[PDB]
Ligand SMILES: Nc1nc2c(ncn2[C@@H]2O[C@H](COP(=O)(O)OP(=O)(O)OP(=O)(O)O)[C@@H](O)[C@H]2O)c(=O)[nH]1
């Protein structure tokens with residue numbers, strides 16, 4: 499409610515995210531061949547940093563634009579054991595043709611600019627358990643009423659195997675968790691692209707406590 | 709003559725301010741944690757003119773997964789700690805030395821104590837006293853430098869410019885041999 503201070507903090511954070519976007523882009527531009535990082539894990543990590551900062555920047559700008567254009571039980575919401583099932587035929591492909599490509603995934607969880615979290619990279623080559631990618635992340639939304647919403651975004655990168663760039667991580671699914679979600683463990687993703695390797699669901703645990 | 713310099717060290721130990729004061733003579737006042745950033749500076753040492761590529765790296769956890777992208781083709785390493793942080797000096801042999809030696813096997817290392825101006829600092833004694841710490845002493849630096857097999861040891865302060873040129877002249881001589 500202190501608007502000058504809030505605007506200064508949003509603006510400082512926007513500049514910070516733009517610096518990350520610029521520098522992650524430069525890092526990717528150095529990946530000219532194998533010796534120099536092309537097709538490497540570090541390239542995937544840079545793609546991830548770039549994606550996150552781009553997304554965070556967008557949220558901050560939307561919040562700032564809002565600012566400038568102007569009883570209920572409270573608790574925490576906790577998400578855990580996120581798993582992303584993939585189609586069996588795709589899983590078989592990673593097994594029989596493992597040098598074809600590197601497939602990375604990550605999940606972004608958001609409830610505003612203040613609460614935006616991205617999982618570490620997960621790959622089919624070593625996060626795949628059964629038919630599902632496992633993510634270690636736990637996300638906690640605290641002190642909120644029953645009108646809360648947590649937006650989930652699923653991203654994938656295929657690594658075949660200014661100067662500012664857009665991340666090669668592509669959005670391959672989304673879901674908004676709310677009060678009605680609590681206690682459920684299986685969710686049907688929206689916006690899954692045609693011919694995606696995703697089975698279609700995301701699995702997780704979502705719990706409220708005061 | 710082109711030489712590539714890479715600078716590494718704990719988060720906020722003064723790597724970027726050192727590079728920017730050397731290359732641009734400006735001291736960046738507001739802290740922005742580095743992800744990946746390269747500069748170029750010209751320098752003449754011992755009558756030899758050298759174009760130094762300055763590769764800046766992240767000290768901070770969020771951003772430190774890219775660091776290996778900076779290591780290829782390195783001619784000289786600046787390995788940094790801050791004079792107001794013995795914890796950062798502590799980290800030299802624990803993590804920084806092993807990482808650098810692995811990625812940069814026979815590249816010479818200059819051990820550099822940053823923020824020299826903070827050795828006589830009311831505020832720093834206080835913070836460190838609470839931690840039981842004593843602001844780093846030149847002998848401690850030199851000793852670690854000898855411990856880790858560094859080509860040399862230098863102390864500087866980006867804020868006052870004191871010792872900066874000397875740091876990069878030494879780095880350049882190491883890169884030429
Ligand atoms: N007093 C004093 N402060 C300094 C000096 N050098 C850097 N600082 C301050 O220490 C903080 C860290 O500066 P940076 O140069 O950005 O540190 P860094 O090692 O590049 O940090 P990372 O990129 O996150 O790894 C900044 O706020 C600087 O203003 C110095 O020589 N003297």
Ligand SMILES: [Mg+2]
Nearest residue numbers: 723724741742
């Ligand atoms: Mg820096």
